[PDB]
Design a binder for this molecule. Structure first.
Ligand SMILES: O[C@@H]1[C@@H](O)[C@H](O)OC[C@H]1O
Ligand SMILES: O[C@@H]1[C@@H](O)[C@H](O)OC[C@H]1O
Ligand SMILES: [Ca+2]
Ligand SMILES: [Ca+2]
Ligand SMILES: [Ca+2]
Length: 474
């Protein structure tokens, strides 16, 4: 159609999340109209250059005293919400609208929430780019809301009543339920399933309803490890989900897991000029974290993050091994020839576009030949000054590691190795071995932070070949 406006997001084929009108997950930062003007058009537009296609809107903040004299009724920010709706429409962005809480996270006012959606549900029902998230963090702090001892009680009744209101006026609009603050472990999933069953019985007539246009909203405050478990278990039970608020700046580890699982996400960094957390346009809170980690997805707009991935290892970041007693739990060896794919100037830099060795990856630029070193396979050769190679890894535990390079060189050479774009080695002199297939292992101790990060080999000179890289904890 003659409109940049995005079409209805729908549940994906795998029923893991809502995806857009191109089959891609929704990814975005947040803004608020709770006590501020609409973020400016030109600031909202910046999200597109950061690989995003969606915006999370905390539209109005509930009044806990409503409807007493002096309380603020819903609908007060309509003129600002309308601007967000229009600006996202024209920019080709999705918009997730919710009720915020101000000082009262982990709480809600049911009447206020029903009246908010009676007004807003019909108002934006026909905006195909707009989704409705019933209520931010309505209970302190997670499932089961259906417990008689939930703090406060009755949130599932609010979810039910609001869902009916929404569907009465907005029959096609995606609805995100619950917005659990802390959603962690097998236990978190099991408790959420109690709430889901109770909701389903009341709304659909059957505890085990198959949702066609609904998902569970959840937040990341259980931490990345526990949240990943809960998401995995819920997805196994057959209920899609959607991350609506989390932070570490960007929580790189949780983003990696949500990408793997096929779950849409809204990060808790704000569109300038203002918000209660950190600005998404400052590199230190988002783009630098993405860049240094090697995280990538296909953006709806622009070419950032760049298309890239792990070569081999089933496309998963190469996790570092640990010790149990005197043995290693898994491989420590990263083959030099298994550099990230992505291309020249993205995942490697090579001075000639052809692989002059012709082997292994003939259609990429890195020069690769068969090796006569122990164990066979291949080595990177024709290494020249200024070339570099990146490998996306995941450091399981922070601390000291032995970093080993299996190298050969007729004469002397120099390398330097960065991790997450931080130099960990300085200049590392590799003395001559006397031949390009006369192999030695060079080792240096490095101190690494935990997490997803790119290991980058920088050739400070030519004159050496590289078979493989090993990393093991001290
Ligand atoms: O009011 C909102 C609050 O509920 C959430 O914790 O952070 C975003 C705020 O604007
Ligand atoms: O790296 C080596 C290259 O420089 C040499 O000239 O051809 C053989 C390779 O091992
Ligand atoms: Ca080349
Ligand atoms: Ca080369
Ligand atoms: Ca090799």
């Amino acid at each position: 159609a003659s409109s940049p406006q995005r079409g209805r997001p729908r549940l994906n084929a795998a029923r893991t999340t809502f995806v857009g009108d191109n089959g891609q997950p929704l990814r975005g930062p947040y803004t608020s109209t709770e006590w501020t003007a609409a973020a400016p058009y030109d600031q909202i537009a910046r999200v597109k250059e950061l690989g995003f296609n969606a915006v999370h809107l905390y539209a109005e903040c509930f009044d806990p005293r409503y409807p007493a004299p002096g309380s603020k009724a819903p609908g007060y920010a309509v003129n600002e919400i309308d601007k967000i709706v229009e600006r996202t429409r024209e920019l080709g962005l999705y918009l997730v609208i919710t009720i915020g809480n101000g000082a009262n996270n982990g709480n809600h006012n049911a009447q206020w929430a029903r009246d908010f959606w009676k007004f807003y549900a019909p108002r934006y029902a026909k905006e195909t780019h707009v989704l409705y998230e019933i209520h931010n963090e309505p209970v302190a702090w997670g499932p089961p809301y259906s417990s008689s001892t939930a703090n406060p009680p009755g949130a599932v009744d609010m979810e039910i009543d609001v869902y009916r209101i929404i569907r009465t006026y907005a029959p096609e609009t995606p609805v995100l339920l619950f917005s659990y603050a802390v959603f962690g472990g097998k236990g978190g999933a099991a408790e959420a399933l109690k709430d889901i069953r109770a909701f389903n019985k009341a709304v659909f007539g059957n505890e085990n309803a198959v949702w066609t246009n609904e998902a569970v909203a959840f937040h990341g405050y259980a931490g990345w490890q526990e949240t990943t478990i809960a998401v995995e278990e819920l997805l196994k039970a057959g209920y899609p989900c959607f991350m609506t608020e989390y932070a570490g700046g960007l929580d790189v580890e949780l983003t990696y897991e949500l990408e793997r699982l096929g779950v849409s996400w809204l990060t808790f960094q704000y569109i300038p000029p203002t918000g209660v957390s950190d600005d998404v346009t400052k590199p230190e809170y988002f783009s630098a974290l993405v860049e240094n980690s090697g995280l990538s997805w296909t953006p709806d707009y622009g070419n950032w993050p760049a298309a890239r991935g792990v070569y081999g290892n089933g496309g998963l970041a190469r996790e570092t091994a640990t010790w149990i007693n005197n043995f290693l739990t898994g491989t420590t060896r990263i083959e030099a020839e298994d550099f990230d794919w992505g291309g020249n100037g993205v995942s490697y830099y090579d001075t000639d576009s052809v692989n002059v060795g012709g082997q292994y990856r003939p259609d990429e630029g890195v020069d690769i030949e068969k090796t006569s070193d122990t164990g066979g396979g291949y080595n990177v050769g024709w290494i020249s000054e200024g070339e570099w190679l990146e490998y996306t890894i995941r450091v399981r535990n922070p601390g000291y590691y032995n970093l080993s390079l299996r190298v050969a060189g007729i004469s002397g050479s120099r390398v330097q190795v960065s991790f997450g774009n931080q130099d960990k080695t300085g200049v590392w002199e590799l003395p001559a071995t006397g031949g390009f297939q006369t192999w030695t292992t060079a080792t240096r101790q490095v101190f690494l932070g935990a997490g997803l990060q790119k290991l980058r080999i920088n050739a400070l000179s030519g004159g050496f070949n590289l078979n493989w890289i090993e990393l093991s904890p001290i």
